[PDB]
Amino acid sequence: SNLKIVRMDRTAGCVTGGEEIYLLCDKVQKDDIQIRFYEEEENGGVWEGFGDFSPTDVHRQFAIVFKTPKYKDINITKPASVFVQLRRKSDLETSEPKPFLYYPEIK
Amino acid sequence: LTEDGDSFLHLAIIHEEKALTMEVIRQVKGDLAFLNFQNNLQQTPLHLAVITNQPEIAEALLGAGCDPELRDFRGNTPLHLACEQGCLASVGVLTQSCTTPHLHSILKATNYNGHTCLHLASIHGYLGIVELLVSLGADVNAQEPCNGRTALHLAVDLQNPDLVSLLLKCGADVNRVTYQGYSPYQLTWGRPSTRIQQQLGQLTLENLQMLPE
Amino acid sequence: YVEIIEQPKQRGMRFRYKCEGRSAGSIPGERSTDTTKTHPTIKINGYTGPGTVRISLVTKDPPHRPHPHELVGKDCRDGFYEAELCPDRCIHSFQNLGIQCVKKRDLEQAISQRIQTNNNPFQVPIEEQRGDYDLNAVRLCFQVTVRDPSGRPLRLPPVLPHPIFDNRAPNTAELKICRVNRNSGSCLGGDEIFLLCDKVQKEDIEVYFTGPGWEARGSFSQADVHRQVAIVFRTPPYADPSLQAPVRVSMQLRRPSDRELSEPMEFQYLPDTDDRHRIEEKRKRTYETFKSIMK
């Protein structure tokens, strides 16, 4: 009932997205769950990205293997901190924000 | 400027031409654009200085005013490196010099693996750096991002009774819990050390045993 | 009410028969090491005075009826243990405890002496014992009686512990590694790995590494077993610290109680390289490009 992210193999990622992450969580249902990445903007709006994965990536209801979404700006030169959270689809309830760090692509 | 993204300053230090370096950083004055130049591994002259154990060159680069907070490709500031490598001189130079409140920021920052200076020092066994970082203002109860572990947890995880003792001596909260709701004591089950389990059995009775179901 | 602190070791118990060396031993705790042997322990929550505890054997699965097997030992009668809660603590430790079996043909006989003294901890319809039983699985029912506000006897609903299995019938639980977040790491060890698997018991599982004349366990806390479906552990250091080229080794889930293994997952130890070595490899590979610049 409560949504909780109890662990992530990694909490930083490249802005280019596409990187794979293991996440451990409290009970969830493979078809009623999503991983929302978000960042508060100056104007009050919010940038949001979703972790990519298929309900089969939801492991025995307690972990999700998925890939990170691309950050809003793949050019930043300094890391940009954002938030990640589990979000249930049926009621849009969410877990407590976890902090995620997007670092520049080094090209 | 060179191939691997390295400038002449980078080389000046990489090949340990202290003389040249001492001078380059002297002839070329207060120019950040060049003193904070990062290479392809995103390392700055400061990073290289401490990686190659040359305290003075780093002390100089700092004097010339470089940036102590720039992160390498692993998200590390030079101090992070200094603590990860156990070089106690480098640590001193990197914490004595920039007495600026930038210290509080550095001591607070984690790298891309979610590690603070105290964490890196604790991961290896550098108790002297650990204790120094604490008296300097690093928070012994700082939690790592991936699981919410504190240096104390890591200590149990590393089965290091000496680190445990030091942390408790520094006021570490034995009842701080990870995101899974566990105390350092609770991470002892499944691990061999009984000494650690003794050092810790002074934490809430409700935080000692695991759960069932 | 009453809870359970030191569950009975639910894996690795030989159900003693009519004559298994006169006696045997004591059913160990859920954490009864071969070093500091502990035993089952309950805690009477909210009462530290005179009372009575009933240790009965019920059935594992949902039907929950008085099991054919008989709990023998000190202070035990018609298949159950009957003793009084000593008026002081609530950390009662049921020391020696034993388990005898009821042969495939003494069910209706065992079920009779089970209703004449009637153990029915849940009181389920005593007329539904016409069914068959799983002689390899049994749970311990805990029935304590305390004094209420007045001073009269107080109910205290039953509480079942983790089922205890016999070391006869094999273990059905499938051992399987489904995914691993990383399959290569330094030969120095210490890399953190997330491994997803099918149900395992945090207290009866290990991540077993094997290579040429080598074998080591991947270290982890039992608390690192997430919902018995994922394990986060660190890689053990390889046999050779100075690896020069990759080495392929196997990694598999191992259940200590019956020594069984999952199919292997390959893992490659790699030669260790820190920033220092890296910088040095860059140094000696730059004398020329630099001497050139020096002049």
mmCIF file with all atom_site columns, C-alpha atoms in Angstrom, chain B residues 2-4 6 8 11-12 14-17 20 39 41 43 48 50-53 72-74 76 81 84-87 146-147 149 156-159 180 182 186-191 208-213, chain C residues 4-7 31 35-36 43 162 182 192 194 199 202-203 218-228 232-234 273-280 282-291 293-295:
data_model
loop_
_atom_site.group_PDB
_atom_site.id
_atom_site.type_symbol
_atom_site.label_atom_id
_atom_site.label_alt_id
_atom_site.label_comp_id
_atom_site.label_asym_id
_atom_site.label_entity_id
_atom_site.label_seq_id
_atom_site.pdbx_PDB_ins_code
_atom_site.Cartn_x
_atom_site.Cartn_y
_atom_site.Cartn_z
_atom_site.occupancy
_atom_site.B_iso_or_equiv
_atom_site.pdbx_formal_charge
_atom_site.auth_seq_id
_atom_site.auth_comp_id
_atom_site.auth_asym_id
_atom_site.auth_atom_id
_atom_site.pdbx_PDB_model_num
ATOM 1   C CA . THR B 1 2   ? 47.620 17.588  -25.577 1.00 0.00 ? 2   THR B CA 1
ATOM 2   C CA . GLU B 1 3   ? 46.042 14.309  -26.766 1.00 0.00 ? 3   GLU B CA 1
ATOM 3   C CA . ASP B 1 4   ? 44.441 12.733  -23.680 1.00 0.00 ? 4   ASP B CA 1
ATOM 4   C CA . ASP B 1 6   ? 45.966 16.987  -20.785 1.00 0.00 ? 6   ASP B CA 1
ATOM 5   C CA . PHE B 1 8   ? 51.225 21.248  -20.197 1.00 0.00 ? 8   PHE B CA 1
ATOM 6   C CA . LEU B 1 11  ? 52.249 16.951  -17.838 1.00 0.00 ? 11  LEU B CA 1
ATOM 7   C CA . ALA B 1 12  ? 54.264 19.267  -15.596 1.00 0.00 ? 12  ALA B CA 1
ATOM 8   C CA . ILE B 1 14  ? 52.316 13.859  -14.303 1.00 0.00 ? 14  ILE B CA 1
ATOM 9   C CA . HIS B 1 15  ? 56.036 13.435  -14.969 1.00 0.00 ? 15  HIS B CA 1
ATOM 10  C CA . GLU B 1 16  ? 56.811 14.881  -11.541 1.00 0.00 ? 16  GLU B CA 1
ATOM 11  C CA . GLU B 1 17  ? 58.798 17.800  -12.887 1.00 0.00 ? 17  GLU B CA 1
ATOM 12  C CA . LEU B 1 20  ? 58.854 23.089  -13.848 1.00 0.00 ? 20  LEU B CA 1
ATOM 13  C CA . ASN B 1 39  ? 41.350 16.433  -19.077 1.00 0.00 ? 39  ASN B CA 1
ATOM 14  C CA . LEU B 1 41  ? 39.144 11.713  -17.442 1.00 0.00 ? 41  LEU B CA 1
ATOM 15  C CA . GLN B 1 43  ? 40.836 15.414  -13.850 1.00 0.00 ? 43  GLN B CA 1
ATOM 16  C CA . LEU B 1 48  ? 46.657 14.784  -10.585 1.00 0.00 ? 48  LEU B CA 1
ATOM 17  C CA . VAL B 1 50  ? 47.082 14.464  -5.078  1.00 0.00 ? 50  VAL B CA 1
ATOM 18  C CA . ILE B 1 51  ? 46.818 11.264  -7.128  1.00 0.00 ? 51  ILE B CA 1
ATOM 19  C CA . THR B 1 52  ? 50.591 11.379  -7.657  1.00 0.00 ? 52  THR B CA 1
ATOM 20  C CA . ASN B 1 53  ? 51.228 12.264  -4.015  1.00 0.00 ? 53  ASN B CA 1
ATOM 21  C CA . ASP B 1 72  ? 36.599 13.885  -11.908 1.00 0.00 ? 72  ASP B CA 1
ATOM 22  C CA . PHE B 1 73  ? 34.908 11.357  -14.216 1.00 0.00 ? 73  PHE B CA 1
ATOM 23  C CA . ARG B 1 74  ? 33.972 9.445   -11.024 1.00 0.00 ? 74  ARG B CA 1
ATOM 24  C CA . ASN B 1 76  ? 35.395 12.932  -7.012  1.00 0.00 ? 76  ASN B CA 1
ATOM 25  C CA . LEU B 1 81  ? 40.810 11.202  -3.798  1.00 0.00 ? 81  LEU B CA 1
ATOM 26  C CA . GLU B 1 84  ? 40.345 7.334   -0.829  1.00 0.00 ? 84  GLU B CA 1
ATOM 27  C CA . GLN B 1 85  ? 44.110 6.964   -1.223  1.00 0.00 ? 85  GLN B CA 1
ATOM 28  C CA . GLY B 1 86  ? 44.915 7.531   2.422   1.00 0.00 ? 86  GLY B CA 1
ATOM 29  C CA . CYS B 1 87  ? 47.437 10.268  1.776   1.00 0.00 ? 87  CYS B CA 1
ATOM 30  C CA . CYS B 1 146 ? 21.780 3.995   -2.453  1.00 0.00 ? 146 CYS B CA 1
ATOM 31  C CA . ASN B 1 147 ? 20.639 2.305   0.781   1.00 0.00 ? 147 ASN B CA 1
ATOM 32  C CA . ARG B 1 149 ? 23.861 3.489   5.133   1.00 0.00 ? 149 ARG B CA 1
ATOM 33  C CA . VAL B 1 156 ? 29.815 -3.709  10.041  1.00 0.00 ? 156 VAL B CA 1
ATOM 34  C CA . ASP B 1 157 ? 29.626 -4.470  6.333   1.00 0.00 ? 157 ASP B CA 1
ATOM 35  C CA . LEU B 1 158 ? 33.438 -4.328  6.245   1.00 0.00 ? 158 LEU B CA 1
ATOM 36  C CA . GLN B 1 159 ? 33.767 -6.274  9.487   1.00 0.00 ? 159 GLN B CA 1
ATOM 37  C CA . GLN B 1 180 ? 15.352 -1.065  4.716   1.00 0.00 ? 180 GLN B CA 1
ATOM 38  C CA . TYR B 1 182 ? 17.977 -1.724  9.650   1.00 0.00 ? 182 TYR B CA 1
ATOM 39  C CA . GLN B 1 186 ? 21.014 -5.823  12.394  1.00 0.00 ? 186 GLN B CA 1
ATOM 40  C CA . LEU B 1 187 ? 23.508 -6.087  9.556   1.00 0.00 ? 187 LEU B CA 1
ATOM 41  C CA . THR B 1 188 ? 25.692 -8.339  11.791  1.00 0.00 ? 188 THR B CA 1
ATOM 42  C CA . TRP B 1 189 ? 23.504 -11.413 11.303  1.00 0.00 ? 189 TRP B CA 1
ATOM 43  C CA . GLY B 1 190 ? 25.171 -13.589 8.715   1.00 0.00 ? 190 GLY B CA 1
ATOM 44  C CA . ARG B 1 191 ? 28.511 -11.963 9.325   1.00 0.00 ? 191 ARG B CA 1
ATOM 45  C CA . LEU B 1 208 ? 18.445 -5.933  17.174  1.00 0.00 ? 208 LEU B CA 1
ATOM 46  C CA . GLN B 1 209 ? 16.763 -8.964  15.521  1.00 0.00 ? 209 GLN B CA 1
ATOM 47  C CA . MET B 1 210 ? 15.558 -9.416  11.931  1.00 0.00 ? 210 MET B CA 1
ATOM 48  C CA . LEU B 1 211 ? 11.945 -10.125 11.008  1.00 0.00 ? 211 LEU B CA 1
ATOM 49  C CA . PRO B 1 212 ? 10.059 -13.210 9.764   1.00 0.00 ? 212 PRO B CA 1
ATOM 50  C CA . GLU B 1 213 ? 7.169  -14.052 7.390   1.00 0.00 ? 213 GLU B CA 1
ATOM 51  C CA . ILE C 2 4   ? 8.237  -15.657 18.997  1.00 0.00 ? 4   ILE C CA 1
ATOM 52  C CA . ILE C 2 5   ? 11.825 -14.459 19.361  1.00 0.00 ? 5   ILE C CA 1
ATOM 53  C CA . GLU C 2 6   ? 14.073 -17.426 18.559  1.00 0.00 ? 6   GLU C CA 1
ATOM 54  C CA . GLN C 2 7   ? 12.134 -19.407 15.933  1.00 0.00 ? 7   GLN C CA 1
ATOM 55  C CA . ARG C 2 31  ? 20.049 -18.787 14.859  1.00 0.00 ? 31  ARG C CA 1
ATOM 56  C CA . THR C 2 35  ? 29.219 -22.400 18.627  1.00 0.00 ? 35  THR C CA 1
ATOM 57  C CA . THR C 2 36  ? 26.636 -20.804 20.960  1.00 0.00 ? 36  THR C CA 1
ATOM 58  C CA . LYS C 2 43  ? 8.199  -13.460 24.961  1.00 0.00 ? 43  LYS C CA 1
ATOM 59  C CA . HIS C 2 162 ? 8.144  -21.165 10.972  1.00 0.00 ? 162 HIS C CA 1
ATOM 60  C CA . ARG C 2 182 ? 27.268 -7.042  -13.041 1.00 0.00 ? 182 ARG C CA 1
ATOM 61  C CA . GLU C 2 192 ? 28.754 -4.849  -4.868  1.00 0.00 ? 192 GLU C CA 1
ATOM 62  C CA . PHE C 2 194 ? 22.585 -7.120  -7.053  1.00 0.00 ? 194 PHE C CA 1
ATOM 63  C CA . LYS C 2 199 ? 12.630 -17.510 -3.187  1.00 0.00 ? 199 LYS C CA 1
ATOM 64  C CA . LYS C 2 202 ? 18.018 -15.502 4.192   1.00 0.00 ? 202 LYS C CA 1
ATOM 65  C CA . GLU C 2 203 ? 19.371 -17.836 6.894   1.00 0.00 ? 203 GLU C CA 1
ATOM 66  C CA . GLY C 2 218 ? 30.302 -13.846 -1.591  1.00 0.00 ? 218 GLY C CA 1
ATOM 67  C CA . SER C 2 219 ? 29.780 -11.969 1.658   1.00 0.00 ? 219 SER C CA 1
ATOM 68  C CA . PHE C 2 220 ? 26.461 -10.467 2.690   1.00 0.00 ? 220 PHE C CA 1
ATOM 69  C CA . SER C 2 221 ? 24.263 -9.799  5.700   1.00 0.00 ? 221 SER C CA 1
ATOM 70  C CA . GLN C 2 222 ? 21.063 -11.751 6.078   1.00 0.00 ? 222 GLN C CA 1
ATOM 71  C CA . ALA C 2 223 ? 19.329 -8.396  6.080   1.00 0.00 ? 223 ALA C CA 1
ATOM 72  C CA . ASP C 2 224 ? 20.691 -7.966  2.563   1.00 0.00 ? 224 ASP C CA 1
ATOM 73  C CA . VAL C 2 225 ? 18.357 -10.689 1.365   1.00 0.00 ? 225 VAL C CA 1
ATOM 74  C CA . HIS C 2 226 ? 15.468 -8.510  0.168   1.00 0.00 ? 226 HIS C CA 1
ATOM 75  C CA . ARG C 2 227 ? 12.094 -10.279 0.457   1.00 0.00 ? 227 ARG C CA 1
ATOM 76  C CA . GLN C 2 228 ? 13.868 -13.597 -0.148  1.00 0.00 ? 228 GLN C CA 1
ATOM 77  C CA . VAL C 2 232 ? 23.016 -7.728  -2.453  1.00 0.00 ? 232 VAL C CA 1
ATOM 78  C CA . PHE C 2 233 ? 26.464 -9.043  -1.715  1.00 0.00 ? 233 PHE C CA 1
ATOM 79  C CA . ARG C 2 234 ? 30.112 -8.212  -2.357  1.00 0.00 ? 234 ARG C CA 1
ATOM 80  C CA . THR C 2 273 ? 43.853 -0.890  -11.886 1.00 0.00 ? 273 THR C CA 1
ATOM 81  C CA . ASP C 2 274 ? 43.488 2.233   -9.777  1.00 0.00 ? 274 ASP C CA 1
ATOM 82  C CA . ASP C 2 275 ? 44.050 5.816   -10.902 1.00 0.00 ? 275 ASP C CA 1
ATOM 83  C CA . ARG C 2 276 ? 47.684 5.594   -9.806  1.00 0.00 ? 276 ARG C CA 1
ATOM 84  C CA . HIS C 2 277 ? 48.603 2.690   -12.102 1.00 0.00 ? 277 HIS C CA 1
ATOM 85  C CA . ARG C 2 278 ? 46.517 4.300   -14.848 1.00 0.00 ? 278 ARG C CA 1
ATOM 86  C CA . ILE C 2 279 ? 48.426 7.598   -14.419 1.00 0.00 ? 279 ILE C CA 1
ATOM 87  C CA . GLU C 2 280 ? 51.718 5.700   -14.498 1.00 0.00 ? 280 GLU C CA 1
ATOM 88  C CA . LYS C 2 282 ? 50.093 7.305   -19.016 1.00 0.00 ? 282 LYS C CA 1
ATOM 89  C CA . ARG C 2 283 ? 53.408 8.611   -17.716 1.00 0.00 ? 283 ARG C CA 1
ATOM 90  C CA . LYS C 2 284 ? 55.814 6.115   -19.246 1.00 0.00 ? 284 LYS C CA 1
ATOM 91  C CA . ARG C 2 285 ? 53.775 6.307   -22.451 1.00 0.00 ? 285 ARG C CA 1
ATOM 92  C CA . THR C 2 286 ? 54.456 10.064  -22.725 1.00 0.00 ? 286 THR C CA 1
ATOM 93  C CA . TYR C 2 287 ? 58.219 10.758  -22.307 1.00 0.00 ? 287 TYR C CA 1
ATOM 94  C CA . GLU C 2 288 ? 58.504 11.648  -25.983 1.00 0.00 ? 288 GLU C CA 1
ATOM 95  C CA . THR C 2 289 ? 55.368 13.766  -26.538 1.00 0.00 ? 289 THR C CA 1
ATOM 96  C CA . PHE C 2 290 ? 56.523 15.710  -23.467 1.00 0.00 ? 290 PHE C CA 1
ATOM 97  C CA . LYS C 2 291 ? 60.295 16.007  -23.928 1.00 0.00 ? 291 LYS C CA 1
ATOM 98  C CA . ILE C 2 293 ? 57.116 20.106  -25.550 1.00 0.00 ? 293 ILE C CA 1
ATOM 99  C CA . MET C 2 294 ? 59.718 20.841  -22.826 1.00 0.00 ? 294 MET C CA 1
ATOM 100 C CA . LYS C 2 295 ? 62.328 22.489  -25.039 1.00 0.00 ? 295 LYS C CA 1
#
